[PDB]
Amino acid sequence: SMPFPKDCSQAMLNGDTTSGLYTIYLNGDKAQALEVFCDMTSDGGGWIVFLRRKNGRENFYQNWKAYAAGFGDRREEFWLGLDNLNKITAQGQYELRVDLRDHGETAFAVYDKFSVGDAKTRYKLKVEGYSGTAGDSMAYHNGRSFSTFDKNCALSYKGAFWYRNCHRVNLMGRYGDNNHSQGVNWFHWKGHEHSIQFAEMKLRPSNFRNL
Numbered sequence: 001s002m003p004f005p006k007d008c009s010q011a012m013l014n015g016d017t018t019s020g021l022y023t024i025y026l027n028g029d030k031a032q033a034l035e036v037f038c039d040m041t042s043d044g045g046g047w048i049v050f051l052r053r054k055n056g057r058e059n060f061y062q063n064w065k066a067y068a069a070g071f072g073d074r075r076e077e078f079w080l081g082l083d084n085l086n087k088i089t090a091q092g093q094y095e096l097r098v099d100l101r102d103h104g105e106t107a108f109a110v111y112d113k114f115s116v117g118d119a120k121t122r123y124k125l126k127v128e129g130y131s132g133t134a135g136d137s138m139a140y141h142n143g144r145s146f147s148t149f150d151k152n153c154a155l156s157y158k159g160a161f162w163y164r165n166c167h168r169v170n171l172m173g174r175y176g177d178n179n180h181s182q183g184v185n186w187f188h189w190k191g192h193e194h195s196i197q198f199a200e201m202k203l204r205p206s207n208f209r210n211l
């Protein structure tokens with residue numbers, strides 16, 4: 001086992017194959033402990049989950065500081081934090097996976113290159129190298145800064161995201177809201193008038209597929 005695993009891939013290779021809460025260590029630094037939910041079953045496992053929607057119990061209409069820091073219950077609905085995402089994605093080349101499920105139908109998107117810039121970039125999104133079944137709805141968002149109501153798409157749709165004008169992905173939108181562009185949307189899968197029941201966003205090293 002690795003003593004200070006820097007992500008869920010180094011925690012999984014540590015022989016922990018059950019999905020659930022693990023400690024990772026940013027930059028392998030024992031002073032930078034972070035509790036994360038690891039999805040150890042989806043497409044080979046080793047994924048840090050950084051967003052989960054599943055029941056509408058948690059409020060995602062939250063401010064910049066909340067999106068920077070993270071909020072919620074890792075075992076249920078939560079957001080990991082943009083500062084965490086920046087520090088993880090700085091450690092190497094990461095891949096994004098998005099898992100979606102609605103009324104028994106499932107879809108996914110994988111982006112071979114995924115990174116989140118630091119606060120001086122307003123947590124700029126990079127997403128490249130799409131494959132999957134959900135449709136490439138993140139391409140629209142590539143290179144955009146993060147937006148919250150207090151830093152207007154976030155205000156207009158009462159969510160938070162790497163908004164443009166405004167979205168094809170709104171996974172931090174209002175739960176069960178089928179009104180146009182208000183809900184948990186992935187446009188190239190279920191459009192803007194269908195709020196998705198279950199959504200996860202997760203990341204792991206892009207080289208995990210052959211390590």
Ligand SMILES: N#Cc1ccc(CNC(=O)N2CCOCC2)cc1
Nearest residue numbers: 069070071072073074078079080081
């Ligand atoms: N994944 C995740 C996730 C991230 C943060 C929270 C709650 N916020 C939080 O832990 N911060 C940082 C440490 O002290 C308390 C404030 C919940 C879920």
